[PDB]
Amino acid sequence: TKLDEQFEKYPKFEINKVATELNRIIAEYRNNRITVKFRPGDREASEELAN
């Protein structure tokens, strides 16, 4: 506001309260990491191929 021949600004505090669940989700993922797995079939050499 103009406020008696100046330009004083409003106070804008920040209280972050939405990041806790996101951090929990990220930690839950990083605890149990997953990758790609190849499964064999009903053949003789499919096991060695997948390995």
């Binding site: 406020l3 008696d4 100046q6 004083e8 600004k9 106070p11 804008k12 505090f13 920040e14």
Partner: peptide, 16 residues
């Protein structure tokens, strides 16, 4: 009708 200026030790928010 003058206005009330800030005290001086009042913190400015982190969002400024």
């Amino acid at each position: 009708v003058p206005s009330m200026r800030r005290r001086g030790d009042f913190p400015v928010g982190q969002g400024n």
